[PDB]
Amino acid sequence: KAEVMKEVIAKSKFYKQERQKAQGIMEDQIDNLDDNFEDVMSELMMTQPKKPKTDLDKEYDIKVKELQLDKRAAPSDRTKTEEEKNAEAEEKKRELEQQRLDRMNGSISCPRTHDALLDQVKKLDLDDHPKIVKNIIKAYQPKLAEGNKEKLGKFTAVLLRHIIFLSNQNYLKNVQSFKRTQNALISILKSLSEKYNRELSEECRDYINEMQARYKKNHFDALSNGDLVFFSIIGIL
Amino acid sequence: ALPEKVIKAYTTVGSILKTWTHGKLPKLFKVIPSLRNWQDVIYVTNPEEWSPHVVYEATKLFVSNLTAKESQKFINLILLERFRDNIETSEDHSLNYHIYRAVKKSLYKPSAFFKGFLFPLVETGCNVREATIAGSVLAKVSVPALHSSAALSYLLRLPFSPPTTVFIKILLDKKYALPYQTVDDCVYYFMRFRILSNGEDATRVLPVIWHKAFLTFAQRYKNDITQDQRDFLLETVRQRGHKDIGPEIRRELLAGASR
RNA sequence: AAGGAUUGUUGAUUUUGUGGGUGGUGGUGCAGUGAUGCCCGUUCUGGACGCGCGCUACAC
């Protein structure tokens, strides 16, 4: 066995040396060739020769231009069967519930500030707030332009303060429309939170710190109706 | 007749490329793309004798520097021939790893690749093994939708052959935004196998590779066809449907909304 | 972005951002073919000899 291996090792080394020797010869040929490049090039240029597409080639180029003119179809995915969708939905529910158990055990302007949103919506009626906020999201989707994710992320914090701000304002006059807005804005906030929960989380804590600081001077007068709303929104999100 | 000094210099290059595996290519070889009469210069370098490593590098150097028209001659005259030769002569009928990459670099220029590799191959007795290896290269590498659609459009009109079906399905498998013209051509292609006056395509036996291709079209472009077109395709399944794949296609076709 | 994104000089093949699927030049057993049962790469570099007498430490 050992003798066979030594022959094997010797053969591998022997072939390795041959490859290296060839490589040693290999580079020398390239070096000599490169030195004579100018002489070879000069003769070739002196002997340079003096100055119809296939029917298949003509058709293909014509097709590309015609295809450019025509409109483009959106591609779709295969429709999953109801049993597969139910199985996938059950698996996701089974996964999500399990992690929860473990955690239990341990044109349109995007307002970067809350005041900016009021200026945009200042002339709009109360029931028009869901329309404007939704449009801002559509006008600044992540795909439309770079940085829209950050603008939408900031807007999530802005929108949250607006929900709390409206609750502070008196609304006994038009409770029905006010009811038609807060839930509508909250639903948008739920969609926004799914993508910008980091941004929402940062704003929420600061409000808690702001909540504490105002409680450190005023006692119950600092507390307001929207303050109760704020604790409720955290529970949803 | 190149200069005798040039012939000896490039004859050395021909020897260089036979055993070349790594390092820097010869300077004379790297300047061949600039030369007008590359055909004569490339021939003396013995393209058939190029090592697989050289073929990969040669496609990189030449596809990049060159015009679209000239690059077609390369992909057709050298890369395509080498691609067929390696598969035919290999014991397992497999393609070498370096040659496999060379096709991808040729795909860097889509128009040259299709008219130099794909269309000549399918129109010159392509075999199923050749289609599978080439199709996988097409599958993994990225292609423009416009160029892919033209290639898909070209394949349909050709007479039905097993190699042609493999290339069509992969293009369908890419999930491209096919132009509305291309979708209609795909619909026409599948209609022509339905029995009606009609050609032999109505009665020609259809392999699953046709059924798999037709399923892919239904899965992805069911929402991009007219209601009448959907009806013709549904009739095609009723006449030429497969035992197991056919019910699935009917489910997908019926689930799509009319454009 | 053609008045130029990207390429080793080239031209929309790529670059940035946002979404996004797949083990797939797989192998193997069955009846070229099969919605097919079963599982699941490339090139270099290195491979204090024994016996034995005596003595000396190890024990609140």
UniProtKB/Swiss-Prot annotation, chain A:
Entry's localization field: Nucleus, Nucleolus
Region annotation (Disordered) ranges: 66-98
Function: Involved in nucleolar processing of pre-18S ribosomal RNA. Has a role in the nuclear export of 40S pre-ribosomal subunit to the cytoplasm.
Summary of subunit composition and partner proteins: Interacts with snoRNA U3. Interacts with EMG1, MPP10 and NOC4. Component of the ribosomal small subunit (SSU) processome composed of at least 40 protein subunits and snoRNA U3.
Family under the similarity heading: Belongs to the NOP14 family.
Protein name: Nucleolar complex protein 14
Species of the source: Saccharomyces cerevisiae (strain ATCC 204508 / S288c) (Baker's yeast)
Part of the intact protein present: 207 to 507 of 810
Curated annotation (Swiss-Prot), chain B:
GO MF: snoRNA binding
Top-rank lineage group of the source organism: Eukaryota
Residue positions, PTM Phosphoserine: 197
Primary localisation category: cytoplasm
One GO term of the biological process aspect: poly(A)+ mRNA export from nucleus
GO cellular component term, pick one: nucleolus
Record keywords: Cytoplasm, Nucleus, Phosphoprotein, Ribosome biogenesis
Keyword check for Nucleus: yes
Cell compartment(s), UniProt: Cytoplasm; Nucleus, Nucleolus
Function, as annotated: Required for normal export of the pre-40S particles from the nucleus to the cytoplasm. Its subcellular location and association with pre-40S subunit shifts from mixed cytoplasm/nucleus to all nuclear in RPS19 disruptions, suggesting it acts after the ribosomal protein.
Family: Belongs to the bystin family.
Additional free-text comment from the UniProt record: Present with 21600 molecules/cell in log phase SD medium.
Name of the molecule in the record: Essential nuclear protein 1
Upper classification of the organism: Eukaryota, Fungi, Dikarya, Ascomycota, Saccharomycotina
Gene coding for it: ENP1
Residues of the full protein shown: 205 to 466 of 483
